[PDB]
Amino acid sequence: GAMNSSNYAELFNNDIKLFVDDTNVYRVTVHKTFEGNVATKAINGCIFTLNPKTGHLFLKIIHTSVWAGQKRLSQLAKWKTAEEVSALVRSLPKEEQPKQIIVTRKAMLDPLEVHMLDFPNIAIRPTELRLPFSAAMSIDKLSDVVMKATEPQMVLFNIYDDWLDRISSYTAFSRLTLLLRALKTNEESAKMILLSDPTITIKSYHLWPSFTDEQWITIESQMRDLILTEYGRKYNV
Amino acid sequence: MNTVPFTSAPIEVTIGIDQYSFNVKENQPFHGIKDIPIGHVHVIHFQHADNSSMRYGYWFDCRMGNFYIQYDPKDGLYKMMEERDGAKFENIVHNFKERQMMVSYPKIDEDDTWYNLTEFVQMDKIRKIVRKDENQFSYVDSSMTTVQENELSDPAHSLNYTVINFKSREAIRPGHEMEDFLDKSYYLNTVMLQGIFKNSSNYFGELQFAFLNAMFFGNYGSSLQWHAMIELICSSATVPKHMLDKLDEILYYQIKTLPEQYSDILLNERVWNICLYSSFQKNSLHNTEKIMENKYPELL
Numbered sequence: 305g306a307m308n309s310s311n312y313a314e315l316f317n318n319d320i321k322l323f324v325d326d327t328n329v330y331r332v333t334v335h336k337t338f339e340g341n342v343a344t345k346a347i348n349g350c351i352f353t354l355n356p357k358t359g360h361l362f363l364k365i366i367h368t369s370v371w372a373g374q375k376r377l378s379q380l381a382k383w384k385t386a387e388e389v390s391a392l393v394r395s396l397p398k399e400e401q402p403k404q405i406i407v408t409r410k411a412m413l414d415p416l417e418v419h420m421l422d423f424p425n426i427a428i429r430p431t432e433l434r435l436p437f438s439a440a441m442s443i444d445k446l447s448d449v450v451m452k453a454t455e456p457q458m459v460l461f462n463i464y465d466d467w468l469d470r471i472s473s474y475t476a477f478s479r480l481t482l483l484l485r486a487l488k489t490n491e492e493s494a495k496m497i498l499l500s501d502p503t504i505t506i507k508s509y510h511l512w513p514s515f516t517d518e519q520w521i522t523i524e525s526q527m528r529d530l531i532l533t534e535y536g537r538k539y540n541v
Numbered sequence: 542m543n544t545v546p547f548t549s550a551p552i553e554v555t556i557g558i559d560q561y562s563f564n565v566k567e568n569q570p571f572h573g574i575k576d577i578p579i580g581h582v583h584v585i586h587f588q589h590a591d592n593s594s595m596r597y598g599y600w601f602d603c604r605m606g607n608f609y610i611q612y613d614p615k616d617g618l619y620k621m622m623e624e625r626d627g628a629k630f631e632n633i634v635h636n637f638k639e640r641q642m643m644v645s646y647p648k649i650d651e652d653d654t655w656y657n658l659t660e661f662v663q664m665d666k667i668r669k670i671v672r673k674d675e676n677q678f679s680y681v682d683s684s685m686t687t688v689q690e691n692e693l694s695d696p697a698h699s700l701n702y703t704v705i706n707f708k709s710r711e712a713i714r715p716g717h718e719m720e721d722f723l724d725k726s727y728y729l730n731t732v733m734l735q736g737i738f739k740n741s742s743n744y745f746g747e748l749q750f751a752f753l754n755a756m757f758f759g760n761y762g763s764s765l766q767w768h769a770m771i772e773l774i775c776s777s778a779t780v781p782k783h784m785l786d787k788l789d790e791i792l793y794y795q796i797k798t799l800p801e802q803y804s805d806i807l808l809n810e811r812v813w814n815i816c817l818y819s820s821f822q823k824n825s826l827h828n829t830e831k832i833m834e835n836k837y838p839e840l841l
């Protein structure tokens with residue numbers, strides 16, 4: 305079935321599952337042509353495939369060459385996403401294959417279902433949550449690897465850095481979604497927050513700064529203030 | 542012209558013969574139906590005055606034997622039977638036609654409706670979908686389920702329609718996932734027409750038989766089959782031009798013949814709006830689209 309606030313802790317049980325987000329697969333700049341018409345120019349994209357229990361992120365980089373000579377790109381993008389996800393499952397040993405894949409947009413259900421017909425025991429599910437994974441390109445090191453790529457390429461990250469050494473996956477996923485929700489509502493403010501203090505650094509093998517527990521609590525409070533703030537600034541409340 | 546004689550009518554019943562139907566009162570002196578046109582399949586069907594639950598009936602072709610109906614008071618229904626003694630069948634029928642205890646199949650001479658609804662339907666194919674090989678006629682009723690319905694439970698009493706499934710390995714070639722799902726030509730032409738049905742006549746015949754079972758018996762599984770087979774053609778970019786033209790006629794007569802008051806249950810809003818306004822063949826069903834829009838503008 306669909307995933308929502310009520311079966312929310314299923315994410316953190318011991319059945320392997322992945323979230324798939326396609327909102328950054330097909331990305332364009334829209335510009336004026338010499339004749340005064342409008343044209344698009346594609347830039348590199350990525351498929352965001354995330355195991356929410358372990359933090360493993362399978363970042364499939366989508367090089368702009370994949371769109372060359374193709375029509376109806378927004379529709380192809382969902383099928384390209386499904387093809388890459390199916391290839392990833394096929395590449396994993398059987399005991400690492402997911403038992404469920406949860407797509408963050410319902411338009412992905414049919415493309416993935418068709419690409420996964422060989423895997424009748426993998427359940428493909430939508431969700432009612434408004435998850436902020438489109439803001440993953442606001443994470444500097446992820447945006448950097450996508451923009452620099454010159455060919456199709458997959459890069460493996462742990463989007464939780466070393467957090468699971470200290471907190472649970474439930475709490476780790478809640479931190480991540482709070483960070484991404486903030487980056488999505490006001491990217492500049494959110495980034496000012498994470499990096500204002502020069503003494504806190506990002507380890508070379510990490511995506512986020514090395515905060516102490518007490519500093520994370522202060523950070524998380526500031527992201528909540530932001531997300532509430534911009535909600536007044538937006539709704540005049 | 543052939544005759545379906547009845548031993549008696551012990552229970553009040555609405556009798557259908559093809560697209561016609563008439564009331565028979567309990568123990569009225571009724572002894573069957575005459576002047577039934579040779580050359581076509583026919584269906585004779587029944588709805589008891591008491592239990593409007595379960596419409597049921599029999600597909601048959603008079604060329605294949607002498608058939609009669611007799612009420613069975615143990616099983617509680619009008620049963621079709623075969624009389625092999627032809628001489629003995631003749632003396633039963635003549636006697637009834639002399640005493641004028643029969644209704645006449647009431648075909649108007651301008652009317653090709655029944656032909657147009659059964660053009661491709663053939664008893665040999667009906668008997669493969671309705672498996673019961675000791676009889677030359679085939680029983681259907683409202684409640685029978687299809688073979689695909691039993692996959693999602695008695696196999697003997699099932700409708701063995703051809704399974705159509707747009708998200709199946711049979712429908713989708715490896716490496717052509719997007720192509721084959723958005724343009725079903727491969728599945729229609731190679732899998733179904735070439736592989737399974739052999740020709741489009743056998744395909745149209747199953748489609749027509751599915752519609753008729755949906756209309757006459759309100760068989761839900763047949764309606765699903767009828768819609769699936771339409772949708773498969775409408776979602777194929779490459780269809781033989783003769784099939785499109787023939788499909789438009791076939792659907793035209795089906796829509797024409799549907800009871801206006803059953804449109805809400807027998808007509809799937811999504812399939813028809815897709816087929817008429819979105820699909821590859823959205824411009825190729827001119828007759829069907831004109832009658833649908835003038836008769837059921839609601840569903841659209």
Ligand SMILES: COc1ccc([C@@H](N)CCO)cc1
Pocket residue numbers: 546547548609610623624630633
């Ligand atoms: C009303 O038509 C009928 C009625 C009875 C028969 C016979 N088979 C019955 C004797 O076994 C045949 C036809």
